[PDB]
Amino acid sequence: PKQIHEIKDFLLTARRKDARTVKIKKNKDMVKFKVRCSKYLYTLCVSDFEKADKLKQSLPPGLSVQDL
């Protein structure tokens, strides 16, 4: 597993073809976005829930999204 520290890099990773699914976990103090790729699972941690909602809105239409 690998951690992405930027929303921009997270979107770049999610845009590529081999991105299978996106999993969103709702923690008490932050929100985790997980993307399943061929080789690695990429996790982006967002401390503020507003930017988390904006990112969720910004997810590509063709990528499956699940809530945890």
Partner RNA sequence: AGUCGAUCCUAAGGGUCGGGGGAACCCCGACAGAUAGCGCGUUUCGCGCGUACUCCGAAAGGGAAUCGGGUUAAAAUUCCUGAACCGGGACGUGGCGGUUGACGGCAACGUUAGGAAGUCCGGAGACGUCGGCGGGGGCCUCGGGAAGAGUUAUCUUUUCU
Partner RNA sequence: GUCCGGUGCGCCCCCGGCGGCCCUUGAAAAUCCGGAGGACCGAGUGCCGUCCACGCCCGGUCGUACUCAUAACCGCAUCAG
Partner RNA sequence: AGGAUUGGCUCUGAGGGCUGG
Partner RNA sequence: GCCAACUCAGAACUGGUACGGACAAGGGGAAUCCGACUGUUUAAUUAAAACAAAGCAUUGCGAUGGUCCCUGCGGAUGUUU
Under the rule (CB under 7 A), what is the footprint of RNA?
1-2, 16-18, 36-41
Closest CB to RNA among 1 and 62?
1
Residue 41: CB minimum distance to RNA, A: 4
What strand order describes the sheet that includes 41-46?
A: 2-4, 41-46, 31-36, 21-26, 64-67
Give CA–CA dist 27/18, Å, rounded: 27
> Least CB distance from residue 39 to RNA, whole Å?
4
Q: Which CB atom, from 53 or from 64, has the smaller least distance to RNA?
A: 64
